[PDB]
PDB file of C-alpha atoms in Angstrom:
ATOM      1  CA  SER S   1    -215.457 -64.672 105.666  1.00  0.00           C
ATOM      2  CA  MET S   2    -217.344 -66.053 102.593  1.00  0.00           C
ATOM      3  CA  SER S   3    -220.448 -63.868 101.876  1.00  0.00           C
ATOM      4  CA  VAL S   4    -219.739 -61.921 105.183  1.00  0.00           C
ATOM      5  CA  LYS S   5    -218.250 -58.508 104.725  1.00  0.00           C
ATOM      6  CA  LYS S   6    -217.741 -55.352 106.765  1.00  0.00           C
ATOM      7  CA  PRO S   7    -219.333 -52.249 105.215  1.00  0.00           C
ATOM      8  CA  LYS S   8    -217.381 -50.983 102.069  1.00  0.00           C
ATOM      9  CA  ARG S   9    -215.000 -48.062 102.941  1.00  0.00           C
ATOM     10  CA  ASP S  10    -214.829 -45.615  99.983  1.00  0.00           C
ATOM     11  CA  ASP S  11    -211.279 -45.997  98.589  1.00  0.00           C
ATOM     12  CA  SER S  12    -211.946 -44.192  95.279  1.00  0.00           C
ATOM     13  CA  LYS S  13    -210.011 -41.050  96.370  1.00  0.00           C
ATOM     14  CA  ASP S  14    -206.998 -42.848  97.928  1.00  0.00           C
ATOM     15  CA  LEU S  15    -204.793 -42.534  94.799  1.00  0.00           C
ATOM     16  CA  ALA S  16    -205.325 -38.818  94.576  1.00  0.00           C
ATOM     17  CA  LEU S  17    -204.926 -38.271  98.266  1.00  0.00           C
ATOM     18  CA  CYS S  18    -201.594 -40.330  98.441  1.00  0.00           C
ATOM     19  CA  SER S  19    -200.376 -38.167  95.481  1.00  0.00           C
ATOM     20  CA  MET S  20    -201.156 -35.003  97.422  1.00  0.00           C
ATOM     21  CA  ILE S  21    -199.346 -36.218 100.495  1.00  0.00           C
ATOM     22  CA  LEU S  22    -196.364 -37.207  98.381  1.00  0.00           C
ATOM     23  CA  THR S  23    -196.361 -33.700  96.775  1.00  0.00           C
ATOM     24  CA  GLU S  24    -196.235 -32.158 100.204  1.00  0.00           C
ATOM     25  CA  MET S  25    -193.317 -34.445 101.217  1.00  0.00           C
ATOM     26  CA  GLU S  26    -191.488 -33.597  97.899  1.00  0.00           C
ATOM     27  CA  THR S  27    -191.772 -29.845  98.565  1.00  0.00           C
ATOM     28  CA  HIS S  28    -190.720 -29.872 102.223  1.00  0.00           C
ATOM     29  CA  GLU S  29    -187.399 -28.116 102.711  1.00  0.00           C
ATOM     30  CA  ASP S  30    -185.893 -31.148 104.496  1.00  0.00           C
ATOM     31  CA  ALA S  31    -186.809 -33.535 101.640  1.00  0.00           C
ATOM     32  CA  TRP S  32    -183.393 -33.152  99.857  1.00  0.00           C
ATOM     33  CA  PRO S  33    -181.810 -36.364 101.242  1.00  0.00           C
ATOM     34  CA  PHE S  34    -184.853 -38.381  99.976  1.00  0.00           C
ATOM     35  CA  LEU S  35    -185.706 -36.925  96.541  1.00  0.00           C
ATOM     36  CA  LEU S  36    -183.605 -39.297  94.462  1.00  0.00           C
ATOM     37  CA  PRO S  37    -182.154 -42.761  94.883  1.00  0.00           C
ATOM     38  CA  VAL S  38    -178.894 -42.952  96.884  1.00  0.00           C
ATOM     39  CA  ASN S  39    -176.046 -43.314  94.357  1.00  0.00           C
ATOM     40  CA  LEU S  40    -174.872 -46.906  95.009  1.00  0.00           C
ATOM     41  CA  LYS S  41    -171.642 -46.372  93.040  1.00  0.00           C
ATOM     42  CA  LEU S  42    -170.692 -43.298  95.082  1.00  0.00           C
ATOM     43  CA  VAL S  43    -171.765 -44.124  98.609  1.00  0.00           C
ATOM     44  CA  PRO S  44    -169.641 -46.795 100.252  1.00  0.00           C
ATOM     45  CA  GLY S  45    -171.527 -49.358 102.261  1.00  0.00           C
ATOM     46  CA  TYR S  46    -175.051 -48.430 101.033  1.00  0.00           C
ATOM     47  CA  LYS S  47    -175.554 -51.223  98.583  1.00  0.00           C
ATOM     48  CA  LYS S  48    -174.580 -53.986 101.031  1.00  0.00           C
ATOM     49  CA  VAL S  49    -176.182 -52.599 104.101  1.00  0.00           C
ATOM     50  CA  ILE S  50    -179.589 -51.252 102.832  1.00  0.00           C
ATOM     51  CA  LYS S  51    -181.339 -54.225 101.429  1.00  0.00           C
ATOM     52  CA  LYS S  52    -184.314 -52.281 100.005  1.00  0.00           C
ATOM     53  CA  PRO S  53    -183.457 -48.724  98.934  1.00  0.00           C
ATOM     54  CA  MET S  54    -186.418 -46.370  98.563  1.00  0.00           C
ATOM     55  CA  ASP S  55    -186.773 -42.663  97.756  1.00  0.00           C
ATOM     56  CA  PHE S  56    -189.519 -40.166  96.858  1.00  0.00           C
ATOM     57  CA  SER S  57    -188.946 -40.267  93.080  1.00  0.00           C
ATOM     58  CA  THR S  58    -189.224 -44.079  93.092  1.00  0.00           C
ATOM     59  CA  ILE S  59    -192.452 -43.887  95.137  1.00  0.00           C
ATOM     60  CA  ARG S  60    -193.772 -41.267  92.703  1.00  0.00           C
ATOM     61  CA  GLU S  61    -193.063 -43.535  89.702  1.00  0.00           C
ATOM     62  CA  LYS S  62    -194.667 -46.594  91.453  1.00  0.00           C
ATOM     63  CA  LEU S  63    -197.713 -44.458  92.371  1.00  0.00           C
ATOM     64  CA  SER S  64    -198.129 -43.068  88.856  1.00  0.00           C
ATOM     65  CA  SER S  65    -197.923 -46.531  87.225  1.00  0.00           C
ATOM     66  CA  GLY S  66    -200.361 -48.467  89.453  1.00  0.00           C
ATOM     67  CA  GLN S  67    -197.802 -50.391  91.347  1.00  0.00           C
ATOM     68  CA  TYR S  68    -199.397 -49.756  94.793  1.00  0.00           C
ATOM     69  CA  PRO S  69    -202.317 -52.138  95.338  1.00  0.00           C
ATOM     70  CA  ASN S  70    -203.651 -50.182  98.278  1.00  0.00           C
ATOM     71  CA  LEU S  71    -202.891 -47.175 100.557  1.00  0.00           C
ATOM     72  CA  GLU S  72    -201.020 -49.413 103.104  1.00  0.00           C
ATOM     73  CA  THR S  73    -198.416 -50.553 100.581  1.00  0.00           C
ATOM     74  CA  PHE S  74    -197.862 -46.835  99.812  1.00  0.00           C
ATOM     75  CA  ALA S  75    -197.275 -46.008 103.554  1.00  0.00           C
ATOM     76  CA  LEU S  76    -194.886 -48.987 103.845  1.00  0.00           C
ATOM     77  CA  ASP S  77    -192.578 -47.498 101.119  1.00  0.00           C
ATOM     78  CA  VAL S  78    -192.712 -44.021 102.656  1.00  0.00           C
ATOM     79  CA  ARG S  79    -191.754 -45.479 106.081  1.00  0.00           C
ATOM     80  CA  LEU S  80    -188.999 -47.566 104.383  1.00  0.00           C
ATOM     81  CA  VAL S  81    -187.383 -44.282 103.227  1.00  0.00           C
ATOM     82  CA  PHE S  82    -187.152 -43.194 106.919  1.00  0.00           C
ATOM     83  CA  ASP S  83    -186.133 -46.562 108.300  1.00  0.00           C
ATOM     84  CA  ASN S  84    -183.331 -46.721 105.758  1.00  0.00           C
ATOM     85  CA  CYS S  85    -182.263 -43.248 106.750  1.00  0.00           C
ATOM     86  CA  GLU S  86    -182.103 -44.224 110.435  1.00  0.00           C
ATOM     87  CA  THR S  87    -180.146 -47.387 109.607  1.00  0.00           C
ATOM     88  CA  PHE S  88    -177.395 -45.439 107.803  1.00  0.00           C
ATOM     89  CA  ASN S  89    -177.213 -41.978 109.390  1.00  0.00           C
ATOM     90  CA  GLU S  90    -176.447 -40.814 112.903  1.00  0.00           C
ATOM     91  CA  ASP S  91    -179.390 -39.103 114.719  1.00  0.00           C
ATOM     92  CA  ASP S  92    -177.047 -36.129 115.307  1.00  0.00           C
ATOM     93  CA  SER S  93    -176.416 -35.309 111.591  1.00  0.00           C
ATOM     94  CA  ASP S  94    -178.248 -33.068 109.154  1.00  0.00           C
ATOM     95  CA  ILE S  95    -179.583 -36.099 107.225  1.00  0.00           C
ATOM     96  CA  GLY S  96    -180.456 -37.999 110.441  1.00  0.00           C
ATOM     97  CA  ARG S  97    -182.507 -35.006 111.723  1.00  0.00           C
ATOM     98  CA  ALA S  98    -184.082 -34.543 108.276  1.00  0.00           C
ATOM     99  CA  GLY S  99    -185.375 -38.115 108.444  1.00  0.00           C
ATOM    100  CA  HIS S 100    -186.936 -37.709 111.857  1.00  0.00           C
ATOM    101  CA  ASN S 101    -188.568 -34.455 110.781  1.00  0.00           C
ATOM    102  CA  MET S 102    -190.000 -35.948 107.564  1.00  0.00           C
ATOM    103  CA  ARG S 103    -191.302 -39.063 109.314  1.00  0.00           C
ATOM    104  CA  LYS S 104    -193.198 -36.812 111.761  1.00  0.00           C
ATOM    105  CA  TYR S 105    -194.561 -34.655 108.988  1.00  0.00           C
ATOM    106  CA  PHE S 106    -195.700 -37.755 107.081  1.00  0.00           C
ATOM    107  CA  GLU S 107    -197.358 -39.497 110.010  1.00  0.00           C
ATOM    108  CA  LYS S 108    -199.464 -36.425 110.837  1.00  0.00           C
ATOM    109  CA  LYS S 109    -200.660 -36.019 107.265  1.00  0.00           C
ATOM    110  CA  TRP S 110    -201.417 -39.718 107.139  1.00  0.00           C
ATOM    111  CA  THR S 111    -203.554 -39.721 110.336  1.00  0.00           C
ATOM    112  CA  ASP S 112    -205.323 -36.480 109.341  1.00  0.00           C
ATOM    113  CA  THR S 113    -206.174 -37.669 105.845  1.00  0.00           C
ATOM    114  CA  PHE S 114    -207.184 -41.267 106.542  1.00  0.00           C
ATOM    115  CA  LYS S 115    -207.727 -41.925 110.387  1.00  0.00           C
TER     116      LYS S 115
END
């Protein structure tokens, strides 16, 4: 509350560390469904159904331009990429499996770097 604070966690490396995680997600072999924005002119149903599209290149641009206020807003966008994928793709599809695999990969890196 006012003039009552928990001890200050060092957040000075968060930006660099989120960038490293994001590099590792970009270079994973199952990243291909997620590298670029879904083409809303060429994919029927996407625009109407997925209210907040997100992809790795869009996260990279937001990261690089100071549009994440803290490491939690960064994790929310990464998770959004996988939640969108699950909303639109069957579990038993290459893209559906890709999304489960990447979400796992991400969550481990996240816990190991920050928890």
